[PDB]
Amino acid sequence: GMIDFTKSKQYTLSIRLSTDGFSFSIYNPINDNSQSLFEKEVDTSLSLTANLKNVFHESDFLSYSYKRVNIMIASKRFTMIPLELFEEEQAELLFYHNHQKRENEIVMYNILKKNNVVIIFGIDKSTYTFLNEQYPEARFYSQSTPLIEYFSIKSRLGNSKKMYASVRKDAIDIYCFERGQLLLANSFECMQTEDRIYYLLYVWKQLEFNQERDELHLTGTLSDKETLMNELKKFILQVFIMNPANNIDMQALLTCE
């Protein structure tokens, strides 16, 4: 899908930020197609903001003008609240009653009107300041926002409850559903197979999922897959590796408004 960069003013740039790497895609609504334009490997010895400044300096495509710029923050620092329980004035209070206080952090939120939920999420302030300078009208999202919208729709096929787990290098993001209704959205810090299984099974038991009927769908960084699947299969009889097995975020972000 060759991008004509001189037409960038008609296109949408989507940027995914995480400690595991940065992803960029350009979406053309005129001919209706996407292009994963670049994958920037992050230097784990530098901060998020320092990595960002480096990639903006090195990349000619990022400073073209786009019609729209979406920024997705992949992080465990988010909290879901049902829309009927959400009040803007309570957003920061709610967030800090679930996450440790942090001075260089800004709290934002996305309303998912169709799903009746709100995702309150943190973003590093230095990172926000830098991105707001480059893109004054960028739209900021928690990675959980498009994932919930996407998984909500996928969960309607079949009369089973569904657990969707997006595995990242240092965390697992868990999204549970019953016929399109979000039951739970949370992230747990974990690096290895034993911890990943621990949280998946904890949530399964917490939500009283049926070991025979209900389903676990996995996507993302699936290291030590054989061990992970062998252990999960002892308890969850319906376990699947989603298609695509990686980068579902952009697929998700592309399916929604």
UniProtKB/TrEMBL annotation:
It holds the Pfam family DUF3822. It comes from the Bacteria. CDD domains: ASKHA_ATPase_BT3980-like. InterPro entries: DUF3822. This is DUF3822 family protein. It comes from Bacteroides thetaiotaomicron (strain ATCC 29148 / DSM 2079 / JCM 5827 / CCUG 10774 / NCTC 10582 / VPI-5482 / E50).
